[PDB]
């Protein structure tokens, strides 16, 4: 019973707004065409499902800064994914478009929450592979960030990846030049792009040459500590990049606001 | 100009 459990509303992006009829819970209803699925996986029930369902179930456990898969259905030519929908919400890309470069205090709270969410993915054996502002939702009342769209993700592994379908302008130079990368250091590079995006108002690189060029020009006033963290995340050599622990111990990352403080100071 | 980037 698919159309009997949810009242489907309007398009959000093929993702529809919906409300769970059981308890009027706001949901997002994501449709995925079978004929367009890159990587397939298998759940415990032996069922062959898109990798996105596998990854979403692995990170679904408990509370997190990750979108929760509440349910899914299979149809003749598609899978349908029932995701939680924060309300009110705005994705981080629209938020930065509207606000310009974020005050460092707000960028620190946001970036910290993205770090916690990505650590959560890695703890659960999941590599997102498409961290970017478009894939981050802001719950505007709670001040909490939610990572979305695992459509490009993989099982986390320590060996080299030679496939990639994420966003190119967030991908690291070793992917650009040699079409290979390791998961964690590639993630860290995309987090550097993301952090620059928050404090400068847009991503630093648009072309391959800039990506592999390893030069970071700051178009906005940014503190030396924040510039240092960004430049560290965007080290050309992957082994030169900080671990997640080194990012969160960085001096710029200290004294983060709580989510609710973040909402009250910056979002209400 | 700031723009989105598909995957
Ligand atoms: C308000 O927009 C949304 C709310 C909840 C979920 C999504 C997408 C999630 C995903 O692809 O995992 C969304 O993006 C349109």
């Amino acid at each position: 019973p698919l159309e009997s459990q949810y009242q489907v509303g309007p398009l959000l992006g093929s993702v529809y707004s919906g409300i769970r009829v059981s308890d009027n819970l706001p949901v997002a209803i994501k449709h995925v065409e079978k004929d367009r699925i890159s990587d397939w996986g298998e759940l415990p029930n032996g069922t062959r499902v898109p990798m996105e369902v596998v990854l979403l179930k692995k990170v679904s456990s408990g509370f997190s800064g990750v979108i929760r898969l509440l349910d899914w259905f299979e149809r003749p030519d598609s899978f349908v994914l029932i995701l939680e929908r924060p309300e009110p919400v705005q994705d981080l890309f629209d938020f930065i478009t509207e606000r310009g470069a974020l005050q460092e205090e707000l960028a620190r709270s946001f970036f910290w929450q993205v770090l916690e969410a990505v650590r959560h993915c890695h703890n659960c054996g999941v590599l997102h592979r498409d961290i970017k502002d478009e894939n981050i939702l802001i719950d505007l009342n709670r001040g909490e960030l939610k990572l979305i769209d695992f459509g490009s993700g993989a099982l986390l592994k320590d060996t080299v990846y030679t496939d990639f379908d994420g966003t190119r302008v967030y991908s690291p130079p070793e992917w650009i030049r040699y079409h290979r990368y390791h998961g964690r250091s590639a993630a860290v590079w995309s987090l550097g792009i993301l952090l620059y995006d928050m404090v400068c108002g847009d991503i630093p690189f648009e072309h391959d040459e800039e990506i592999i060029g390893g030069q970071v020009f700051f178009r906005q006033r940014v503190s030396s500590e924040c510039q240092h963290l960004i430049r560290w995340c965007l080290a050309l050599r992957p082994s030169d990049r900080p671990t997640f622990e080194e990012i969160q111990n960085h001096p710029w990352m200290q004294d983060v606001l709580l989510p609710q403080e973040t909402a009250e100071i910056h979002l209400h | 100009k700031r723009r989105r980037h598909p995957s």
Side-chain angles (χ1 to χ4, degrees), chain A residues 1 5-6 9-18 20 23 26-32 34 37 40-41 44 46 49-56 59 62 65-67 69-164 166-176 178-208 210-214 216-236 238-259 261-268, chain B residues 2-7:
Chain A
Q5 262 196 276
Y6 300 91
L11 274 170
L12 306 170
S14 300
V15 181
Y16 295 80
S17 194
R20 187 165 64 186
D23 61 345
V27 298
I29 298 174
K30 175 165 181 178
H31 298 248
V32 167
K34 283 184 191 181
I37 287 173
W40 291 79
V49 308
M51 187 60 48
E52 184 179 355
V53 172
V54 169
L55 305 176
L56 281 164
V59 303
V66 180
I67 211 70
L69 182 71
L70 305 171
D71 201 7
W72 58 276
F73 306 69
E74 183 179 357
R75 281 170 162 184
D77 291 273
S78 56
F79 290 82
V80 184
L81 281 55
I82 314 292
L83 305 157
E84 73 190 336
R85 170 174 55 90
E87 171 64 18
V89 75
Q90 190 180 39
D91 76 35
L92 181 56
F93 178 96
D94 291 340
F95 187 89
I96 289 163
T97 298
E98 289 178 21
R99 287 227 190 173
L102 307 184
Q103 294 178 29
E104 287 191 29
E105 182 183 74
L106 177 55
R108 164 182 314 111
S109 164
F110 280 4
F111 191 65
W112 183 270
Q113 288 188 45
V114 173
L115 290 161
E116 292 285 316
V118 172
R119 287 180 58 196
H120 173 72
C121 290
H122 292 187
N123 297 338
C124 300
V126 171
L127 186 70
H128 185 284
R129 293 203 295 186
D130 198 17
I131 302 160
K132 59 175 178 178
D133 57 4
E134 304 183 64
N135 289 339
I136 296 171
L137 299 177
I138 306 157
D139 178 326
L140 296 165
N141 277 1
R142 296 175 62 76
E144 289 168 5
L145 268 53
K146 295 237 166 293
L147 190 56
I148 64 167
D149 190 359
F150 286 74
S152 313
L155 295 182
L156 179 64
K157 70 186 176 185
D158 300 319
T159 55
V160 68
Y161 294 85
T162 56
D163 71 288
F164 178 77
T167 302
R168 189 170 179 92
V169 285
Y170 286 74
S171 69
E174 60 273 24
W175 167 248
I176 302 298
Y178 312 110
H179 274 197
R180 46 165 180 83
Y181 61 98
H182 289 81
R184 291 174 188 90
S185 56
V188 164
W189 174 281
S190 75
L191 288 164
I193 300 294
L194 175 66
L195 179 48
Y196 185 101
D197 180 48
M198 296 186 187
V199 298
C200 291
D202 199 9
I203 58 179
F205 308 133
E206 292 286 345
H207 309 284
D208 294 351
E210 296 168 328
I211 294 172
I212 70 174
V216 189
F217 166 91
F218 280 88
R219 57 188 79 193
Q220 281 282 299
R221 199 277 160 178
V222 175
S223 67
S224 295
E225 293 84 352
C226 182
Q227 290 198 15
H228 173 275
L229 179 54
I230 290 170
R231 288 200 168 100
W232 196 8
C233 288
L234 304 177
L236 290 182
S239 59
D240 286 341
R241 291 169 206 155
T243 66
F244 283 84
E245 176 175 26
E246 291 173 304
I247 297 177
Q248 291 192 290
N249 290 331
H250 192 277
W252 185 76
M253 293 253 69
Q254 301 316 291
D255 297 305
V256 69
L257 294 177
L258 308 181
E261 293 166 343
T262 301
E264 296 181 342
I265 294 169
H266 286 291
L267 308 180
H268 299 172
Chain B
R2 167 176 170 79
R3 68 181 196 86
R4 292 175 174 270
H5 309 81
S7 308

